């Protein structure tokens, strides 16, 4: 199955996904340039953003956090349990198993069988030259067009400063001859009505790309190199990873930021068969496009069930009125 999520999400007072600034106390936030129609004349505005790479990283974190609860969490890499994005990065010709075992980098099917990270997010092994695309694909998080139109662009940057305090058993701070250890850093603080949209191409979970299908009597069928309940648990964990992406675990310095996280409205499509990508929330006329897509995809023989949150979506397209995301996970996993 390839479930797609999209919609409009509000992030207020978030310091998520900074840029570091290149070695400056004033920490730069992720600024991305976007285009707005702006009636007669188009405009280009540079606005704070959350990159899809870090969104994928946080989806990985959620998946590996919800995968340890399953009894089949041994296949999960212990480096994933500590939220590590590294995978065969530099000279890593072997892999470390959660139970202290060494896994070779040959027979990609065995790699994805013994590593849940390989199955869900792909891998890159430069030493052995092993390639596997990430099944989860995250889009960029940008403020939607009507937001810029109504706020006339704005800045969405406040730049609150933060410092340190030291007593060093002396009651003072100290000069540079002792270390100071008191740093003044000002981190950009942003907001806006953003758009969340990540696709979970989960139909390849447990299916290596080397030999995706087999033909014993000349029919196409997925190559499931693992036993079925392991694949079902992996699918369940991947779907559950959607839950923190909307309750809110994403964003940089989550310990000090934890932005108030909710989606203003949401659309989800299960779509067991391959389908077009669901449009990410940035626009104004996407309601019509989504309505047409859903109302005419069933004419192509696609048994897509649509879950709708805070969108009317007319009255003739059938949909499931929802108000959370774990209910979405439950109704997605009760059929698979």
């Amino acid at each position: 199955m390839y479930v797609r999520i999209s919609g409009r999400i509000r992030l207020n007072a978030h310091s998520l996904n900074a840029q570091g600034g290149g070695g400056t106390n004033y920490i730069e936030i992720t600024k991305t340039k976007v285009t707005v129609r702006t009636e007669n004349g188009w405009t280009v505005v540079e606005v704070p953003a959350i990159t899809g790479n870090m969104l994928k990283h946080w989806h990985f974190v959620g998946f590996v956090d919800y995968f340890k609860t399953t009894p089949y969490g041994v296949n999960l890499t212990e480096r994933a349990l500590r939220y590590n994005g590294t995978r065969f990065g530099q000279g890593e010709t072997t892999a470390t198993k959660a139970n202290g075992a060494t896994v070779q980098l040959n027979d990609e099917a065995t790699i994805i069988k013994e590593l849940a990270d390989a199955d869900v997010h792909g891998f890159l092994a430069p030493k052995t030259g092993r390639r596997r695309v990430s099944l989860v694909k995250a889009s960029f998080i940008l403020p939607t067009e009507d937001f810029i139109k109504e706020v006339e662009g704005e800045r969405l940057i406040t730049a609150i400063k933060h410092n340190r305090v030291d007593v060093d058993e002396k009651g003072a701070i100290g000069s540079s001859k002792e270390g100071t250890a008191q740093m003044l850093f000002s981190r950009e603080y942003a907001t806006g009505l953003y758009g969340f949209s990540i696709v979970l191409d989960l139909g390849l979970v447990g299916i290596p790309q080397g030999l995706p299908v087999k033909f014993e009597e000349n029919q196409p069928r997925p190559n499931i190199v693992i036993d079925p309940n392991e694949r079902k648990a992996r699918i369940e964990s991947a779907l559950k990873a959607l839950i923190p992406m909307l309750s809110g675990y994403i964003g940089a310095n989550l310990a000090r930021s934890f932005p108030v996280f909710k989606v203003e409205e949401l659309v989800a499509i299960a779509s067991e068969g391959p389908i077009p990508a669901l449009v990410h929330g940035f626009y104004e006329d996407y309601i019509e496009a989504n309505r047409s897509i859903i109302k005419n995809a069933r004419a192509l023989g696609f048994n897509i069930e649509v879950f709708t949150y805070n969108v009317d979506l007319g009255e003739d397209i059938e949909a499931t009125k929802v108000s959370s995301v774990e209910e979405l996970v439950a109704n997605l996993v009760k059929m698979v």
Partner: protein, 107 residues
């Protein structure tokens, strides 16, 4: 060109031999997509003019060059007709560009 006063003042605000070290103001001035934060940054820059003026004699330092009325008038005239963020960011980052220099630091 008609900017030596502002550049020298910003340098003396940011450089050494002044034990003040206001870098937050320079960061606010530099990266200014809109006019609000650019104006707040230039306000914060000119705010510590009395501090520099009074503390200059506390060490034996020449007084800084306060920006001229004509220079600030020209800046205000040329900042009003700002719609596209490109040239606004250009002007702000150039302000910060002559903010840092290697002037004769308090001879």
């Amino acid at each position: 060109g008609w900017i030596r006063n502002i550049g020298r003042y910003l340098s003396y605000l940011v450089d050494d031999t002044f034990e003040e070290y206001a870098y937050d103001v320079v960061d606010g001035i530099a990266k200014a997509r809109t006019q609000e934060e650019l104006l707040e940054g230039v306000y914060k820059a000119l705010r510590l003019a009395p501090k520099l003026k009074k503390k200059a004699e506390s060490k034996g330092c020449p007084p800084p060059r306060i920006p001229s009325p004509e220079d600030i008038e020209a800046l205000e005239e040329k900042v009003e007709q700002l719609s596209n963020p490109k040239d606004l960011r250009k002007l702000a980052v150039s302000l910060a560009l002559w903010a840092f220099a290697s002037w004769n630091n308090c001879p």
